[PDB]
Write a protein that binds this DNA or RNA. Structure first.
Lengths: 191, 197, 136, 194, 172
RNA sequence: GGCCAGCAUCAGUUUUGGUGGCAGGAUAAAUCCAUAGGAAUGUAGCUUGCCUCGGUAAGUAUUAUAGCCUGUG
RNA sequence: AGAACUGGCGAUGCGGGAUGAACCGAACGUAGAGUUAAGGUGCCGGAAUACACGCUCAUCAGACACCACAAAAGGUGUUAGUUCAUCUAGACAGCCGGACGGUGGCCAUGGAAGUCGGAAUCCGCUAAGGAGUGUGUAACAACUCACCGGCCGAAUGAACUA
RNA sequence: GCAGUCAAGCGUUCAUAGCGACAUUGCUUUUUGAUUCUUCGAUGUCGGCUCUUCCUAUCAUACCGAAGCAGAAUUCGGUAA
RNA sequence: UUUGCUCCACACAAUAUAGAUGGAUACGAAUAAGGCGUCCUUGUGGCGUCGCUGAACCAUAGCAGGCUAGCAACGGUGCACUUGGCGGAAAGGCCUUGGGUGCUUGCUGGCGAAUUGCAAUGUCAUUUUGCGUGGGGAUAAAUCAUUUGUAUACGACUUAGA
């Protein structure tokens, strides 16, 4: 029905800074720098009082209005990722075969290899995306920790681990094997 | 109005530009089309790839060598759309097609000449903001064109040379405007302003 | 640290926004938006320029960067008073837009004798520019 | 596509490669490459100007070589000329390697080694016109067949009303260009080595 | 069917000897000319009373002009239309400058959104909305907000030449 | 004195502009002017509460330092 | 296949439906000029890439009577509407707090207390707390929903119509 | 001949894992009819052999989804010629 | 194979044309954004300005454009040379140095035009070939026949022979 004016606000905290060049959002904070290309959405940014940013859509349809809210969420995810960080935690579950995962290095890429998954002799390799820091957890049995700034790079690298250890030609309800997300949190403490 | 009109194919629609050029060719105007690899087609990339595959499977059954020829270059894809807009089987339609030259990128001497655009054929001026469009260079590579990287390497080298030419021209234009501003406050400057000049 | 975001100033369709009719019987006169009917139709009034108050389509007019305080739905007598108070026709004539417009009817009104005089005057001016440009 | 920019030849060419450019060697005056040899009669600017263009341009560099048929027991007496692409870094030294190898010889041991898999490119043995039974491997018709049994019975349907391009039919057999891959090298022999 | 006008039409139901001076029924008809206006008048009296063109006459036909043709109003219009399946009743609100102009856009809107032709639309009533917040449709509420300013973040200005020597700019 | 044309003044057919004088409607309706009444997408003022000496925020207030609507003439 | 009325084809070219004996327009001496019919005006193709309001995105869109096919049934695709319900006495969604007292109800018996199961649905406190929505315990425990509130700020829920 | 819609019931309980009555909507021209438009101053008639190509309404192989799928073996469905 | 072949300056001829009659006047990129100018801590920076079409810009006055006299400038422009550099995607073009020479309407003059008789494109292109003058350069092959068999119906293919 072509909503004349729909608008969402973006709250920017103390330490970080946001710079936009005609759609190119650059969020720079204590943990680093994040850049995103949003040139496929066609929204309008405006700075109000150096602590709040407003995004406006003029004469947009229902689908185009639905693309307004995802703009604010993507920028907020970029903002919270450079102050609080993003920390994904997984657990290894197996019935008989202990899954062995180690950090390897070929051609300077820091792959993640998986061994002894359901007794398979094949070594599945998972490449670590840039910005994601992989660390093995302490005092918890079979836990891996994925940490980084970009939520869409930590979770996608996380999704690669979850989808590489699939079970085929068996009953999924019985063979409870895989690398599953346990908790999606933040890197910084107290929050 | 001009002996040879050079049209920049970047940002244009293959169908709306061809219909413009086909009418100009029939009227006896020579047309040169450059940068045919940057032409735009309305609809998503998967739409146009499926349409070309439907065209690709159309061939003469008993001899594939005499059927419809599926050209892969972006210049010839634009030519195929333009060829069907002209009565090319007559002597008048054949003479019109010899007045047209279509190239990928910007070739020699047409690189040192002025390029124009067709306002009723720009993608930005015809498509609603939000509609998906396909680039002819990417579509051609997916169907069998193997010169996308060669043109892109040559086009990048050409832009460096043209940027240096523009810096000399922009600096010379600023020197011209300084002398034209000093030409003001005189008798001949005020008399020209009275006559609209 | 700066939080720079580009502003990208736009001409808003609003009460008091001065329009320039480009298609229709007026074709070049100045009017002001009185009330907004919908997304595509607006109510304009050009009493100083002679434009009758009417409902016009937004495609037949082009908004100007001039704006003056006008109440919503103000009648013709009210619009004409605020037009002269803000001196809209004086600010418009000082803009480069109107000076570029007023230049093009002046060239179109040039006679054959005046077209010859412009040729002579530009040759005298070109002599001074070429002399000044060749010594620096 | 790729396009050759210029070609540079050696100062002296043997009669083996000179015989390639003629159809009647015995009648000709053997004037080939006589005026081109005057380019080396200068200080070398005529050849050096062309080499500089190959280093600047020409991202692909190929060498012109010809066989030594006189060491071969064939009676052809005419060498075969072919282009071989150079594999190496820094396009400039490809020209410099070719320049220093003009009129010099290259052996197999500098190109191929033992236990290497190579592709052989050659034209097959010719057999002339051959029937469809042996050219395509089609089954022979029974003995009771009239008007010949070494044929293809049905060459197509009523519709389409044409002979298909994909039906087996008699014609030329052999003398085709083929390249078989994955051929292991077992011995790199030496002629001087008894 | 065209650029409309508003007419008032009075029928009479021609006098018999038994009944002189009949009731003089009246309607308001939206039409392009007086010929269609008189035709639409008889079409509706044939749906309400035992009267037709042969049994009655047209006393008077007068064109009704807008009292304030240059003041933007909100119009609440009730319509009854025939669809491909059955008959339905609608209520819509149109923000326009006159009753005639608001009716003209309704026929365009009814044909666009419901594929209803002019022959299948009955105008039940065109009434003015006196007070704000009595407007029930959201697409009319948007233009009644205080201090309403909206831009046009795209500018496709039409050209007259087949070739232009500069790339167009959609700044606005 | 042929043949082929140009221009002018005409006639027949027709096409495309400029412009004048009148007759009708609610003797157009409006705008406009005068008068009365009224309302908020509530103007000034007043008052309240936050506040980088003022800008906002919600109550009051029917023309005031903005205006509008309706009726009548 | 067989009748009725009328118009056509056959006996009929012409303009249109790309194409066609019947359809639309219109019927024909030889020419000129003007105007139209039916049908069209992005290019082929003579004529506005006219104007105006909307609708539609289709990983087999659609595009014009005769006409060269598509249905029942479906879609939190999108648009418009109908009816009912919540509603200025703060809804919807989310988070958070309580979620019980009489009472392990009358039953059954290796054992059953709101939750294997059969038959009953009341009282107190009150803002609300169902002899209880699911998880679980041999059985209790623990957790949660119904239900009522804390804060957050205006439209929202359901069934249908095309 | 093939495919849907509705869901009374079967399925240990559980309509829709799998099926599925009573009804109803279609598709296909590989069956057989019906018709008599083309051909009786002739289009050589069944089957097999031989050979090419195409269709998908998929038997197998590839990748997946579902199950009253533990494994094994099957069943149903999807992308697919 | 009777002084032939090729190239440049020129002269006379014919032949040919999908159509010269002021100038095809060169950033890139974005379009819910940019161009230009300027400042600055050189940035996704501050400020100013511009668009709303090339309706521009440059060029344009003289017998299709004469003959001459000066003034003011040390410019503008054409041509033949020359210096240097860049350009390979189809470069075959672009930029630049030095002087020579011609014109100059930047300004002020003096003569000449008619009769082509009231309009009749009023000839102003380059395309190839031919032919003569004379200024440079170059001094071969192929095929048939014979022969070979890595080939082959015949042609073709592969070889050889002063």
């Amino acid at each position: 029905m072509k909503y004349i004016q729909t608008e969402q606000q973006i709250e920017v905290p103390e330490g970080v800074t946001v710079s936009i060049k005609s759609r190119i959002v650059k969020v720079v904070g204590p943990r680093g720098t994040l850049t995103k290309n949003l040139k496929h959405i066609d929204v309008t940014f405006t700075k109000v009082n150096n602590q709040l940013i407003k995004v406006a859509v003029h004469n947009g349809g229902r689908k185009h209005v639905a693309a307004l809210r995802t703009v604010k969420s993507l920028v907020d995810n970029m903002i919270t990722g450079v102050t609080k960080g993003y920390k994904y935690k997984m657990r290894y579950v197996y019935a008989h075969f202990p899954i062995n995962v180690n950090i390897v290095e070929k051609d300077g890429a820091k792959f993640i290899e998986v061994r002894n998954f359901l007794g398979d002799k094949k070594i599945r390799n998972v490449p670590v995306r840039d910005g994601v820091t992989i660390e093995f957890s302490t005092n918890v049995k079979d836990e891996i920790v994925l940490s980084g700034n970009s939520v869409e790079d930590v979770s996608q690298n996380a999704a690669d681990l979850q989808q590489i250890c699939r079970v085929r030609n068996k009953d999924i309800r019985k063979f409870l094997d895989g690398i599953y997300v346990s908790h999606k949190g933040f890197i910084t403490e107290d929050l | 109005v001009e002996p040879v009109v050079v049209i920049d194919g970047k940002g244009h629609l293959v169908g709306r530009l061809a219909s413009v050029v086909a009418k100009q060719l029939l009227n006896g105007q020579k047309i040169v089309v450059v940068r045919a690899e940057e032409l735009n087609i309305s609809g998503e990339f998967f739409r146009n790839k499926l349409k070309y595959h439907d065209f690709l499977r159309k061939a003469t059954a008993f001899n594939k060598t005499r059927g419809p020829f599926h050209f892969r270059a972006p210049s010839r894809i634009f030519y195929k759309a333009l060829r069907g807009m002209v009565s090319h089987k007559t002597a008048r339609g054949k003479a019109a097609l010899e007045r047209l030259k279509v190239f990928e990128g910007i070739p020699p001497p047409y690189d040192k000449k002025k390029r124009v655009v067709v306002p009723q054929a720009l993608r930005v001026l015809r498509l609603k903001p939000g509609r998906k469009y396909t680039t002819l260079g990417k579509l051609s590579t997916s169907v069998g064109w193997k010169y996308e990287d060669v043109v892109a390497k040559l086009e990048a080298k050409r832009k460096v040379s043209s940027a240096e030419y523009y810096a000399k021209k922009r600096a010379f234009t600023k020197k011209v405007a300084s002398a034209n501003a000093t030409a003001a406050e005189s008798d001949v400057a005020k008399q020209l302003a009275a006559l609209g000049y | 640290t700066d939080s720079i975001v580009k502003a990208s100033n736009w001409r808003l369709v609003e009460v008091g926004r001065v329009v320039l009719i480009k298609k229709g019987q007026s074709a070049g006169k100045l009017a002001a938006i009185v009330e907004i009917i919908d997304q595509k139709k607006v109510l304009i009034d050009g009493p100083k320029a002679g434009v009758p108050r009417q409902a016009i389509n937004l495609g037949q007019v082009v908004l100007t960067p001039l704006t003056f305080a006008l109440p919503r739905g103000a009648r013709t007598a009210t619009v004409s008073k605020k037009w002269a108070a803000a001196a809209v026709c004086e600010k418009w004539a000082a803009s480069s837009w109107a000076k570029k417009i007023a230049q093009r009817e002046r060239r179109a009104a040039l006679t054959d004798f005046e077209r010859f005089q412009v040729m002579v005057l530009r040759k005298q001016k070109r002599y001074t520019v070429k002399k000044a440009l060749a010594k620096a | 596509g790729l396009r050759s920019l210029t070609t540079v030849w050696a100062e002296h060419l043997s009669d083996e490669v000179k015989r390639r450019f003629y159809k009647n060697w015995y009648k000709s005056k053997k004037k080939a490459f006589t005026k081109y040899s005057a380019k080396y009669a200068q200080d070398g600017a005529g050849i050096e100007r062309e080499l500089a263009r190959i280093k600047k341009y020409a991202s692909v560099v190929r060498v012109l070589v010809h066989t030594q048929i006189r060491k071969t027991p064939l009676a052809q007496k005419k060498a075969h000329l072919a282009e071989i692409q150079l594999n190496g870094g820094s396009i400039s030294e490809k020209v410099d390697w070719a320049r220093e190898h003009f009129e010099k010889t290259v052996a197999v041991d500098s190109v191929f080694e033992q236990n290497e898999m190579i592709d052989a490119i050659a034209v097959t043995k010719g057999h002339g016109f051959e029937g469809v039974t042996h050219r395509w491997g089609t089954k022979k018709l029974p003995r009771k067949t009239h008007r010949g049994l070494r044929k293809v019975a049905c060459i197509g349907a009523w519709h389409p009303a044409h002979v298909m391009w994909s039906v087996a039919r008699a014609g030329q057999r052999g003398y085709h260009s083929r390249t078989s891959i994955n051929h292991k090298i077992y011995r790199v022999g030496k002629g001087d080595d008894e | 069917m065209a650029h409309f006008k508003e007419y008032q039409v009075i029928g009479r139901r021609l006098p018999t000897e038994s009944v002189p001076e009949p009731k003089l029924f009246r309607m308001r008809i939206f039409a392009s000319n007086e010929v269609i206006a008189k035709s639409r008048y008889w079409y509706f009296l044939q749906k309400l009373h035992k009267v037709k063109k042969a049994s009655g006459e047209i006393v008077s036909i007068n064109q009704i002009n807008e009292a304030h043709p240059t003041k933007v109003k909100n119009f609440g219009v009730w319509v009854r239309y025939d669809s491909r399946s059955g008959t339905h009743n609608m209520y819509k609100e149109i923000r326009d400058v006159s009753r005639v102009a608001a009716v003209e856009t309704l026929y365009q809107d009814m044909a666009a959104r419901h594929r209803a032709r002019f022959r299948s639309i009955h105008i039940l009533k065109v009434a003015e909305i006196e007070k704000t917040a009595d407007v029930k449709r959201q697409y009319v509420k948007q233009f009644l907000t205080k201090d309403l300013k909206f831009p046009l973040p795209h500018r496709v200005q039409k050209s007259t030449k087949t070739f232009s020597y500069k790339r167009p700019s959609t700044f606005y």
